[PDB]
Subunit: 204 residues, 2 copies
């Protein structure tokens, strides 16, 4: 019993293996084309064992979405949601854009994220998750706008935060999920940035 072995229990290993296998299957085949049988086989567990851990395929999804939320908050949002961003924006709105777009472009796990976007059309948890993340990024954007003029609240800045982030996110997607040369990606980013700078400055 007290012999040299990993601290993590076998039941946790198998649970983690199921989740990683399902995540990868969902990512590659899309969620609706993946069967419970296929998940069990690829995880090297019986179908009965898979059901002991997860009552349905959607319960597996619930668990993966929760993990993506933490990944988002810890690896992408923590640096964006910082006085650093507010300071940067106050000094020059253009440098705020440059840094933010790089942060969003640096976001990892784009393959599974795409699957969450698909699932937003069909699965309420997926829609809610992405709306919350989007809302947090819009709110950060709103806070930067307020910080520029040292305001407490401004409805027109809230509306602007929505439009500006929607455009930012559109630019990120063009760069992330579409094929471009290094040079074409550079020009899209520059045109996008210069354009968003002019817009933001027009309302400040």
């Amino acid at each position: 019993k007290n012999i040299r072995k990993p601290k993590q229990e076998r039941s946790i290993e198998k649970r983690n293996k199921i989740l990683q296998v399902a995540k990868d299957l969902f990512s590659d085949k899309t969620y609706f084309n993946v069967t419970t049988n296929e998940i069990a086989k690829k995880a090297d567990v019986s179908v009965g064992t898979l059901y002991a851990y997860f009552a349905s395929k959607e319960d597996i999804l619930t668990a993966l979405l929760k993990r993506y939320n933490d990944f988002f908050l810890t690896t992408i949002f923590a640096d964006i949601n910082s006085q650093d961003s507010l300071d940067r924006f106050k000094k020059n709105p253009k440098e705020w854009l440059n840094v933010l777009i790089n942060q969003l472009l640096a976001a990892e796990d784009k393959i599974f994220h795409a699957q969450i976007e698909m699932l937003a059309y069909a699965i309420p948890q997926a829609k809610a998750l992405l709306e919350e993340h989007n809302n947090n990024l819009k709110n950060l954007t709103y806070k930067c706008l307020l910080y520029y003029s040292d305001q407490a609240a401004n409805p027109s800045f809230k509306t602007l935060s929505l439009v500006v982030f929607d455009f930012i996110s559109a630019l990120v997607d063009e760069l992330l999920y579409h094929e471009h040369t290094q040079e074409e990606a550079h020009q899209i980013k520059k045109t996008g940035i210069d354009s968003l700078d002019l817009i933001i400055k027009s309302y400040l």
Copy 2:
């Protein structure tokens, strides 16, 4: 029969939208269209065949109605007159798009079904190319790599604005402010390069 094929496509379209495509079966379509499983099969071998027929219809409708107008010489002239008036017109046409509910299902399906992804990318590339043609026409230029880049950015922003308005709940006043902010901003960006 022709009429029955149309009824089935009508029914299948409504089902795909209400329920999620992946969850709808051919049996379900047959039952809702009041037709036998054998009859339906005679019309369409698989569910994917029904979808292809709906996608082909969507393509022809995009090409013949909405894209034909956007791609007209008349459209080029409006841009040259006032790009803001052109923006207003295009954005209002996009906001009034027919079959928006089914279109969202196509957007979802584009992640899983190559033909749906291909179709939407063609329509998006079409709209970007027209935008480019508009910029060239304004300037009387044959080619401009900076305007080609611009056309991608601008159309991406246009699409983002339309989606914000179509897919999210806003008070009447907020929706008016989002639309106005969006349009004014696009007009500002376009004019900065002209």
